[PDB]
Amino acid sequence: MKNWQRIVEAKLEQQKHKVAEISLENGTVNYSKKIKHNRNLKALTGDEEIVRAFLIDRLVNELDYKPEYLETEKEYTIKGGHSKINPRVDVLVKDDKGNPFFFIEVKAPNKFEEDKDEIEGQLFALAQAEERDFKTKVKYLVYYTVELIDDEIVDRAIIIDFEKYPTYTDWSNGGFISTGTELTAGYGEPKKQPLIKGHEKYDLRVRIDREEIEGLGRNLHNVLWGGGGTNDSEIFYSLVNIILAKIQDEYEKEDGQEYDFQVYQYGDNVESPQKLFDRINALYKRALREQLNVTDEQKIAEDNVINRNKFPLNKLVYTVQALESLSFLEGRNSLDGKDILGDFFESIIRDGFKQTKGQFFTPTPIVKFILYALQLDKLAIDRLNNDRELPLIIDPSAGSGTFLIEAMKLITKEVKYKQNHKVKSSRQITKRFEELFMPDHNENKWAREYLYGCEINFDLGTASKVNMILHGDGSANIFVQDGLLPFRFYVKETSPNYLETASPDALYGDKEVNGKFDVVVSNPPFSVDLDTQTQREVRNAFLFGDKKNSENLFIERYYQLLKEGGRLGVVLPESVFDTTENKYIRLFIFKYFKVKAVVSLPQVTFEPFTSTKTSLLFAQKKTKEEVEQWNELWDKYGKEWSLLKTRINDYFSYFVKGRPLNKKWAPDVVKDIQEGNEDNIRKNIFRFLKDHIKEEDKNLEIKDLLIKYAEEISSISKHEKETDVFGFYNAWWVFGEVAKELDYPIFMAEAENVGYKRTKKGEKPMPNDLYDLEYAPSTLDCEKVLSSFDIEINALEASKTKLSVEKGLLEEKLKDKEDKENEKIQKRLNKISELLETIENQLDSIRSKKLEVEGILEKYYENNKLKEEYSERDDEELINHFKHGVLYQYRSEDILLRNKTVHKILDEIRQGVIWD
Amino acid sequence: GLIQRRNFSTFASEPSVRFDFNYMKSVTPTTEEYYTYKSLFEVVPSTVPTLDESEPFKYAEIGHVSKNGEVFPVTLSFEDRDELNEDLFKKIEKGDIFLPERGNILISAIRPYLNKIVLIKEDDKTDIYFTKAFIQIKPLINSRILYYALRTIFSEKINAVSRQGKGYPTLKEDDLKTIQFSKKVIDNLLAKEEELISNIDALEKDIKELKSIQRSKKEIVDEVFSSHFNINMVELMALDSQRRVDVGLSSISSLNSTIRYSYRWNKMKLIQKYLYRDIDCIEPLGKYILSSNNGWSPESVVGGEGIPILGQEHLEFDGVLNVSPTKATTKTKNNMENFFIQEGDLFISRGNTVDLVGLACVVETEVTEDIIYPDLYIRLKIDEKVIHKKYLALLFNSFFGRLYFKYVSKGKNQTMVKISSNELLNYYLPIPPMEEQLEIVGKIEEQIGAQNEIEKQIEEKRNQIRVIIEETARS
Numbered sequence A: 001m002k003n004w005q006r007i008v009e010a011k012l013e014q015q016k017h018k019v020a021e022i023s024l025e026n027g028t029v030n031y032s033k034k035i036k037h038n039r040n041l042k043a044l045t046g047d048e049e050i051v052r053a054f055l056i057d058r059l060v061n062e063l064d065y066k067p068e069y070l071e072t073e074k075e076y077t078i079k080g081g082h083s084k085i086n087p088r089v090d091v092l093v094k095d096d097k098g099n100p101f102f103f104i105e106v107k108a109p110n111k112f113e114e115d116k117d118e119i120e121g122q123l124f125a126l127a128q129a130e131e132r133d134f135k136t137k138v139k140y141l142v143y144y145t146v147e148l149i150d151d152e153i154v155d156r157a158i159i160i161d162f163e164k165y166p167t168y169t170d171w172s173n174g175g176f177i178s179t180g181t182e183l184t185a186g187y188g189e190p191k192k193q194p195l196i197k198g199h200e201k202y203d204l205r206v207r208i209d210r211e212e213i214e215g216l217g218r219n220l221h222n223v224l225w226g227g228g229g230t231n232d233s234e235i236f237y238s239l240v241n242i243i244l245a246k247i248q249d250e251y252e253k254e255d256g257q258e259y260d261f262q263v264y265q266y267g268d269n270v271e272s273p274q275k276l277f278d279r280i281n282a283l284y285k286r287a288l289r290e291q292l293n294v295t296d297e298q299k300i301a302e303d304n305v306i307n308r309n310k311f312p313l314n315k316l317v318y319t320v321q322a323l324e325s326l327s328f329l330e331g332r333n334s335l336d337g338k339d340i341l342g343d344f345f346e347s348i349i350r351d352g353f354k355q356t357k358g359q360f361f362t363p364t365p366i367v368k369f370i371l372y373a374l375q376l377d378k379l380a381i382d383r384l385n386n387d388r389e390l391p392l393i394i395d396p397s398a399g400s401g402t403f404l405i406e407a408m409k410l411i412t413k414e415v416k417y418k419q420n421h422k423v424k425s426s427r428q429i430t431k432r433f434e435e436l437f438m439p440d441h442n443e444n445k446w447a448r449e450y451l452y453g454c455e456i457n458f459d460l461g462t463a464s465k466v467n468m469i470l471h472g473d474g475s476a477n478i479f480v481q482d483g484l485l486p487f488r489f490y491v492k493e494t495s496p497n498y499l500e501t502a503s504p505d506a507l508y509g510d511k512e513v514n515g516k517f518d519v520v521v522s523n524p525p526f527s528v529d530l531d532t533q534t535q536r537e538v539r540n541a542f543l544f545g546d547k548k549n550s551e552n553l554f555i556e557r558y559y560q561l562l563k564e565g566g567r568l569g570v571v572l573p574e575s576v577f578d579t580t581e582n583k584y585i586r587l588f589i590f591k592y593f594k595v596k597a598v599v600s601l602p603q604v605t606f607e608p609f610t611s612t613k614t615s616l617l618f619a620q621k622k623t624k625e626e627v628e629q630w631n632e633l634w635d636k637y638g639k640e641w642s643l644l645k646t647r648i649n650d651y652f653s654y655f656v657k658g659r660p661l662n663k664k665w666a667p668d669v670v671k672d673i674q675e676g677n678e679d680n681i682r683k684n685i686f687r688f689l690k691d692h693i694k695e696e697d698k699n700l701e702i703k704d705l706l707i708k709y710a711e712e713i714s715s716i717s718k719h720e721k722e723t724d725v726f727g728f729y730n731a732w733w734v735f736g737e738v739a740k741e742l743d744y745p746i747f748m749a750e751a752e753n754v755g756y757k758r759t760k761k762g763e764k765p766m767p768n769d770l771y772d773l774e775y776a777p778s779t780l781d782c783e784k785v786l787s788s789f790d791i792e793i794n795a796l797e798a799s800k801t802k803l804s805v806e807k808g809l810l811e812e813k814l815k816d817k818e819d820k821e822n823e824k825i826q827k828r829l830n831k832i833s834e835l836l837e838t839i840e841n842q843l844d845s846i847r848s849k850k851l852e853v854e855g856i857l858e859k860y861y862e863n864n865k866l867k868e869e870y871s872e873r874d875d876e877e878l879i880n881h882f883k884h885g886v887l888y889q890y891r892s893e894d895i896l897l898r899n900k901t902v903h904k905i906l907d908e909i910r911q912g913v914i915w916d
Numbered sequence B: 001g002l003i004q005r006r007n008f009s010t011f012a013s014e015p016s017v018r019f020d021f022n023y024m025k026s027v028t029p030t031t032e033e034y035y036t037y038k039s040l041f042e043v044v045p046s047t048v049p050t051l052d053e054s055e056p057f058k059y060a061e062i063g064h065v066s067k068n069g070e071v072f073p074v075t076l077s078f079e080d081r082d083e084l085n086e087d088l089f090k091k092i093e094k095g096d097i098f099l100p101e102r103g104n105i106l107i108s109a110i111r112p113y114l115n116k117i118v119l120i121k122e123d124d125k126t127d128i129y130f131t132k133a134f135i136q137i138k139p140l141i142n143s144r145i146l147y148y149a150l151r152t153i154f155s156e157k158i159n160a161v162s163r164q165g166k167g168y169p170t171l172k173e174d175d176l177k178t179i180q181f182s183k184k185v186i187d188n189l190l191a192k193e194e195e196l197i198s199n200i201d202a203l204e205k206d207i208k209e210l211k212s213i214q215r216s217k218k219e220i221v222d223e224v225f226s227s228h229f230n231i232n233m234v235e236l237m238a239l240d241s242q243r244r245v246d247v248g249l250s251s252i253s254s255l256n257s258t259i260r261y262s263y264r265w266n267k268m269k270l271i272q273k274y275l276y277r278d279i280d281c282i283e284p285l286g287k288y289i290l291s292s293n294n295g296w297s298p299e300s301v302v303g304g305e306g307i308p309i310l311g312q313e314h315l316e317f318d319g320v321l322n323v324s325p326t327k328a329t330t331k332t333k334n335n336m337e338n339f340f341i342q343e344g345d346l347f348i349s350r351g352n353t354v355d356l357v358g359l360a361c362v363v364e365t366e367v368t369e370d371i372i373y374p375d376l377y378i379r380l381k382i383d384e385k386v387i388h389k390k391y392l393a394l395l396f397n398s399f400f401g402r403l404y405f406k407y408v409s410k411g412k413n414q415t416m417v418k419i420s421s422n423e424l425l426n427y428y429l430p431i432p433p434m435e436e437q438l439e440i441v442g443k444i445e446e447q448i449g450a451q452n453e454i455e456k457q458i459e460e461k462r463n464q465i466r467v468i469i470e471e472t473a474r475s
């Protein structure tokens, strides 16, 4: 039950002059009979009637304007298209000379945001007809509405002059060139009053609801893009620059000083070319100076905010008005402090940015599957409970910061809301939780010191930083440098920098290793192009610097970032898994990482942008002891390989090349040959050819066996090319012998559909093999659901009471009057009564579905919480109930974590894979 | 949704230590008796054979070979220097040619999942030159048995050892040698060889009967148009094969407007006069043409992982563009807005053989991905109110258009003749009411659906062969 309704009722009751009255008990509205009305309005159709009554009362009682000069519901017969329409005007304010000074149209608050185009269709035609017929002069068309700032209702007016912009083409340069935001009493010139920071009368808006925000995104999209679609460049990045300037100015302003992201119209007209551009350019210069690590004055010298020819300033002035009233840096405060501006950013991120080959964004279904398959939520919970810290996360190819955004949301929505019962209540752990998550306004503030990133693009880096500001981080960790640079090159002069540290590692080859990040999630680019000026330096810090596969250097970075036990969940292309020339890198991953899972993503997971096949690698870095065991096994079996190669080449030389059986060339071979021991010869041949051999070859002799095999001997004898990280041994033979000792199981899986079909024309979902949503919430308020249906039933019951009362009174006059002409009224009241029983019947159907919904509630929710027998959520009936039938609302779209049954790949990955 | 849970040690079963869902679905903990390629086959290395330039050769590049195992070679000669043939010659002169022997099974090395396996047997005396990326193997065991086994049974293993990488699946000789062939299946096939080969011979004989009874698209279109217009085909074959025309002076200026006198032009006019004798409502195409845009195609290679491009074989007589691109362009252009193929468009063949020149097609399937149509194409936008898009394509593929374009075409050789837009402007058509055009299209569609029933019976027979092979091998 809304409090502002009581506030309005009390304010109207305190008014001395009762010129407009409202009765909630009877649901009636009363006005003075002096004003002529063409229809007898007696029913409350919505909040629009209340708004109109309040505005009329305020105009009559506060502004000292005579009520008789106001005209309502004046009817004109207009010719619309090929038919005749009969629209009416809401408010007409005319002076003593009869000229219509104010043509005020009132629109319902529910459709206030959506119904903006109708001003072209419902207002312009009437004004044109009036000017054509009555020869009147309209000075300023005025539209009035209410604005909710700091939970207070204030005026909000838009002023448009038709004389100033006669043609439609000219109007485009205006870009919200209205006279002023608020009206002036005493016929004074309207003045725009700047929003003084921290000044109670006028400030930025908080508690902004969604219904104004999707519509806002919609009309800004329609204006800025203008139906262009997706051709990228200035249409998108300019919005980023404007938002960055807004954030910078909202940061640098002090309390009591107005914001510079405001249009001044003291002279009734602002110069859009000059006055806006100067302030916006200064703001963006300050933004690049402070928020984006200065980037040195050398870059600022050639910096430019927008393109002069490509981006007209009219859209800039249009957007300044839209974005001035909002609070981008700190306001938010939507639905108990949750983020609304962030979703307003992914809207526009998905639309205005055209993505092509070489510029992809990882789809959200894959990102959250990767994050949940690493068990990041329970990792963070265990880390907080034991070490009193949160895991350190880095994406060295962040791009638009998708992985970081979803990781931040995951941690915040898991450690605080969904899996809160896991954390301990101990005093020190409680204090750490207070320092990390408790402030509702700044719940996403742990990301300041924990989430890191790296993007080589300046534009995408700036976009990711702005997005991270909007969500609530503060950025300061998304470096806009290259991801492959040496560690000391990552400097930010801020809160402790974990990425700058480096140290040499003995087992890695005495190269730099950071080893401070708990989790690495990334989507490394295909065929990365190294910087020519730094290549000779950066390629010297990696083992496989010059192997002509630059992208395979990224797999090395992860080893240098993760600590012993770190979790890797990157998205590699299929070429890493099958191509022969990558055999070196596969012998790297096997040596240092414990490959725990591999998932074969389908071909359409990145279509239509790229058709290459990709796969998921979930691995964990080995400790020093395991790498030492690997090295000792490698040497132990390399010795055997060398000795075996010597013996086998000696045999193959003797039996065909016919060298003499002298003593000095092989001791054991000549000893066995002279002693006549061919069993040992056969054993050595078998051990060398441990592969490519069959049991039947036991019957072959030491001549025909070799002449039959031949090329396998030569293939095995050849050692690896690298020779620096693998040594002078055959990689395949020694690797097989080593992996025999260190054998461990490996999870492998395939996905047929990833829950979507991405194509240029449209979007078509398919069944999602990766995971399943919850649908059924784990916490649903029975009281709220009951009170909802209670409020609709009460709202209709008030109407059913007033209609019953009026039909009873009409029956009373029917019994009283002689019924000469009252028989028609009797028929009318009978018809409305029958309509009353029909609406009562549909209300009884509503009651029946309410009762069945209640039955569902006690069938599934006990103690206002979902009970454990449906926690695993295999119940088909519950899912079907929540996918439609008024239960579509509420609901939970979170990924469902099943602990009992294995239906989708995420379930087996979460259950059958043991980390640590 | 397929979980395998392999072991670490199983990764070292291949010399390049692969690990991916494919080839590890095939690698299984269970061990059975098996054969290697040393016992069932032998890879014949490719050699460049000497060829006479004058004597024509039959050549195919992957796409010509069908999935069912029938080769569709093109006959070309070295001294032609054909415009379309320039890239084929450049490929051939570098060694991209191959002469398979007799009794050897050829296996494609590009996209093995299409099952483009070809058997070369001693029955056919003619020898076909093949492209590279075909792995010749000499079957030590009966060639037919191994051909049938590789096409049906051991196809999963061949798909396993294929390496995708960034691009498309490929096959290599060493990977082929890596495949393990079960002892039991091969032993059962060798024990039931006589019965199995007799069964496959009978089924393939039935298939050849069904192919013989099938009737081609060109005959369908020609017969439908002749029946509708009452044209007598033997009369045209008498008039068309004359080589002597007696032309009067007055006949020169009949719908000519340029006073063209030539043997070809007057022969075409005589044939048209015979055709349009009883038919009325003859009208030019220049009045009802809206626009004509010539496509263009840059340098490209088979594959290339770029935007796809079509080929000259994609045009069909039925009037439907059979979209199945094989090659693509890897580099980008500046403008590509109209170079993509859209639904419901009319495509005209500019340069081709004197028979298949001016061939027209209509795009009816969903284009989805944008595909580049080559230079030897014309997008034709026409007045939809008077003439239907598919009717023009059917007329052009009929003898009505073939006879006109065999004399109008201007080319330096019979292998390629190039038409232009001028004759498209000046071409004369029988244009009945749109109802008649829809009726003609309906007759053609039903008579083509009948043939579709015939080939669906054909794959029914193919599946019967596959089932026989599988049931013989399994037990």
Ligand SMILES: C[S@@+](CC[C@H](N)C(=O)[O-])C[C@H]1O[C@@H](n2cnc3c(N)ncnc32)[C@H](O)[C@@H]1O
Residues within 6 Å of the ligand: A358, A359, A360, A361, A362, A363, A396, A397, A398, A399, A400, A401, A402, A403, A454, A455, A456, A457, A482, A483, A484, A522, A523, A524, A525, A526, A528, A529
């Ligand atoms: C593969 S996309 C997707 C990245 C991220 N997963 C996302 O969705 O935003 C990342 C882009 O950033 C670029 N990039 C990131 N790190 C880079 C680096 N260290 N060097 C060069 N380019 C890099 C790549 O060119 C690539 O086009």
